[PDB]
């Protein structure tokens, strides 16, 4: 994909449609983070008639571009579903009918625009993906009775918690590369996510890349699942940042990688493999830090969060940080098999007793949503760096 391949005539033709579609509103059916299952209803107008949004489609995996705000769509979903239990965790997508997959709704920007951040765009892997590999797998991977609707967790991931805190739209380009992902879409670099995003952004209206907050975390699935070499992940990561900044990005959040060798799946690994993967993470994290320093010197607005250090603290002494267990999967999974993401799994007795909000790990690989929230809160804290970005205020 290349944004340069899109012509002015193509942009005009695409934007000249003004069709309509419906909104699928998803929600968690159970009343805590222990239960990942979800269901949906069509969004409704206040009188119960079906809600529609006007706009146009584009696909190079179709996105719907509308002038209806994300806040209004969310409100319609909340009013329609009327969930009164905790952890409703509502999300929504465009869909013409029940056979459609979950398409992202993009709210076009207005002509009148200053310098405030007006959306978050996320790049990365299974620590950030909110539904891309899930759509590519026709909703079979990860299994949606046990992993929360296309997220590799029991709920929202860190980018979603940041977006919620700042009252911003989140548009996700991250692609899960966890074990078993190979079967739905060949491994691609994070630079290919940047290229794809820029092609979709060419169809947006009044889009100013300097008003996007970009998030980038990558490399964990590459080292753990694809045995990639550090020099190749460095090249992919550097290329992505060159392309993103060349396209006009100014505001980027970077993070170091957690030491994933502390995850339960490495109970089934050799010490040699633990040492090999760990050394790659250590080396790659220094490259992330050097890239951040470089882009700061070049004049960009960069934050760098040391997720590696936060995660070392959580796995070393979970109780100091509000967790009870950082060594075991919450799910009753007693092996490290790619196939396990295809099946449903129950909580262990111990996780059910203490609750999944007290565990660091959901399955054998990924953090629980309580950890994702903990990461987001650390990143949002005063002095942690986000003050350098131009956020809107909201009196509510
Ligand atoms: Cl997992």
């Amino acid at each position: 994909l290349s944004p340069e391949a899109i012509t002015s005539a193509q942009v005009f033709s695409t934007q000249s449609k003004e069709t309509y579609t419906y909104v699928r509103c998803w929600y968690r059916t159970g009343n805590s983070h222990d239960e990942s299952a979800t269901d949906w209803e069509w969004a409704e107008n206040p009188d119960g008639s079906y809600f529609t949004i006007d706009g146009y489609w584009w696909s190079s995996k179709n996105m719907f571009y509308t002038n209806t705000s994300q806040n209004v769509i969310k409100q319609r979903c909340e009013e329609t579903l009327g969930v009164t239990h905790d952890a409703a965790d509502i999300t929504y997508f465009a869909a013409d009918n029940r056979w459609s997959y979950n398409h992202t709704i993009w709210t076009n920007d207005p002509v009148m625009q200053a310098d405030q951040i007006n959306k978050i765009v996320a790049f990365g892997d299974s620590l950030s993906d909110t539904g891309n590999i899930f759509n590519a797998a026709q909703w079979r991977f990860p299994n949606p009775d046990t992993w929360f609707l296309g997220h590799f967790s029991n709920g929202f991931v860190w980018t979603e918690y940041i977006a919620q805190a700042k009252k911003l739209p989140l548009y996700n380009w991250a692609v899960g590369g966890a074990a078993g992902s190979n079967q739905y879409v060949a491994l691609t670099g994070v630079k290919d996510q940047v290229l794809s995003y820029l092609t979709y952004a060419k169809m947006a209206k009044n889009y100013k890349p300097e008003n996007t907050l970009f998030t980038l975390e990558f490399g964990l699935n590459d080292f753990m699942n694809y045995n990639r070499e550090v020099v190749d992940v460095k090249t992919d990561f550097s290329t992505a940042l060159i392309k993103l900044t060349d396209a006009g990005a100014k505001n980027i959040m970077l993070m170091t990688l957690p030491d994933a060798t502390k995850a339960p799946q490495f109970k089934y690994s050799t010490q040699a493999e633990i040492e090999k993967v760990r050394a790659k993470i250590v080396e790659f994290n220094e490259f992330i830090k050097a890239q951040a320093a470089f882009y700061i010197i070049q004049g960009y607005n960069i934050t760098l969060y040391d997720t590696h250090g936060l995660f070392e603290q959580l796995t070393q002494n979970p109780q100091q940080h509000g967790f009870v267990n950082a060594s075991d999967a919450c799910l009753n999974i007693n092996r490290a098999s790619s196939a396990d993401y295809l099946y449903s799994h129950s909580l262990t007795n111990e996780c059910a007793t203490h609750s999944s909000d007290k565990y660091v790990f959901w399955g054998v690989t990924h953090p629980t949503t309580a950890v994702h929230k903990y990461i987001a809160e650390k990143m949002l804290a005063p002095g942690a760096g986000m003050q350098r970005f131009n956020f809107h205020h909201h009196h509510h």
Side-chain angles (χ1 to χ4, degrees):
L1 283 73
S2 166
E4 285 58 47
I6 294 181
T7 68
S8 302
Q10 242 184 308
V11 176
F12 183 86
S13 175
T14 296
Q15 294 180 346
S16 73
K17 311 313 183 23
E18 281 302 331
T19 189
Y20 70 95
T21 192
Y22 300 90
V23 173
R24 186 182 287 146
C25 306
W26 293 91
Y27 63 102
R28 188 190 300 270
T29 53
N31 65 11
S32 82
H33 296 150
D34 294 357
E35 301 168 38
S36 289
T38 49
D39 205 339
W40 64 272
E41 296 299 348
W42 295 115
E44 291 165 10
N45 294 306
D47 69 354
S49 63
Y50 290 123
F51 179 68
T52 58
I53 52 172
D54 294 339
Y56 56 91
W57 291 100
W58 192 73
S59 170
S60 62
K61 324 224 158 184
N62 228 328
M63 188 157 75
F64 191 77
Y65 301 69
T66 184
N67 289 334
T68 296
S69 66
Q70 301 284 306
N71 295 328
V72 164
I73 297 168
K74 176 67 166 303
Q75 178 181 344
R76 290 285 174 273
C77 283
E78 291 170 334
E79 289 167 346
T80 298
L81 297 171
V83 179
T84 50
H85 67 70
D86 291 346
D89 296 353
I90 288 166
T91 61
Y92 51 81
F93 297 97
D96 279 348
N97 54 59
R98 62 276 353 154
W99 287 287
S100 307
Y101 287 104
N102 282 332
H103 304 286
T104 293
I105 299 161
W106 175 279
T107 300
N108 270 330
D109 297 311
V111 170
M112 295 295 306
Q113 229 182 117
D115 303 322
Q116 295 99 328
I117 298 294
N118 60 36
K119 59 189 91 307
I120 300 174
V121 169
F123 301 114
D125 61 10
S126 68
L127 226 44
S128 296
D129 189 7
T130 61
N132 288 322
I133 204 80
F134 184 72
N135 277 315
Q138 307 202 109
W139 299 357
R140 297 167 301 169
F141 173 94
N143 187 305
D145 200 75
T146 295
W147 288 271
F148 179 75
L149 194 77
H151 299 60
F152 288 83
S153 193
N154 56 335
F156 291 136
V157 299
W158 65 281
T159 52
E160 289 166 309
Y161 286 120
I162 291 181
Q164 286 162 20
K166 297 304 189 184
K167 303 197 169 174
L168 285 168
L170 171 67
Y171 302 117
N172 173 60
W173 259 256
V175 185
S181 299
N182 321 48
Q183 156 168 353
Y184 310 106
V185 66
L187 177 64
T188 43
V190 74
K191 70 110 162 142
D192 304 305
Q193 296 172 26
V194 170
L195 286 171
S196 170
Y197 171 72
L198 294 173
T199 302
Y200 285 82
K202 189 138 175 193
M203 298 304 192
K205 290 182 191 173
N206 311 304
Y207 180 62
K208 297 169 73 182
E210 58 267 35
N211 293 342
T212 295
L213 178 58
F214 292 97
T215 66
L216 172 60
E217 56 82 20
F218 199 74
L220 204 64
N221 301 152
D222 267 28
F223 295 141
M224 279 169 58
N225 189 45
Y226 290 92
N227 189 53
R228 297 259 290 154
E229 298 308 315
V230 176
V231 72
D232 293 328
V233 180
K234 287 178 170 180
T235 297
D236 180 41
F237 192 90
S238 167
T239 296
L241 289 174
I242 289 167
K243 186 74 217 76
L244 188 57
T245 58
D246 194 78
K250 291 189 196 158
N251 302 281
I252 307 172
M253 302 189 79
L254 301 176
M255 72 168 49
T256 57
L257 300 183
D259 183 357
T261 70
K262 302 300 180 163
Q265 64 161 103
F266 287 92
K267 289 174 179 187
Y268 315 101
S269 185
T270 70
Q271 202 60 34
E273 188 70 359
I274 288 169
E275 295 166 347
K276 176 197 194 139
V277 174
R278 180 178 293 146
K280 290 187 179 177
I281 290 171
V282 170
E283 187 184 345
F284 188 59
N285 281 349
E286 294 310 305
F287 187 75
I288 296 166
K289 295 170 192 179
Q291 286 290 290
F294 173 61
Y295 281 100
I296 286 170
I297 279 154
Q298 290 295 95
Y300 293 89
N301 283 335
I302 307 295
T303 59
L304 174 62
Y305 187 73
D306 184 25
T307 300
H308 174 273
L310 183 64
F311 208 72
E312 208 82 341
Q313 298 174 0
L314 280 185
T315 58
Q316 285 170 343
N317 190 0
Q319 293 184 289
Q320 193 63 28
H321 306 276
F323 294 86
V324 312
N325 183 305
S327 51
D328 307 321
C330 176
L331 298 173
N332 184 34
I333 296 171
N334 302 293
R335 65 190 191 179
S337 172
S338 64
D340 274 322
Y341 292 113
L342 298 167
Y343 316 124
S344 55
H345 309 272
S346 294
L347 275 67
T348 63
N349 294 322
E350 313 95 85
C351 195
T353 289
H354 285 108
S355 93
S356 64
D357 287 339
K358 291 287 187 160
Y359 272 58
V360 171
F361 294 99
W362 177 236
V364 296
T365 296
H366 293 95
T368 64
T369 193
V371 174
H372 278 281
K373 174 63 168 295
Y374 192 73
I375 292 163
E377 292 297 307
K378 293 289 180 181
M379 291 171 76
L380 293 161
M386 292 188 66
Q387 52 264 10
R388 71 193 58 206
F389 305 122
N390 295 341
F391 293 111
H392 285 300
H393 296 86
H394 308 273
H395 73 92
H396 284 289

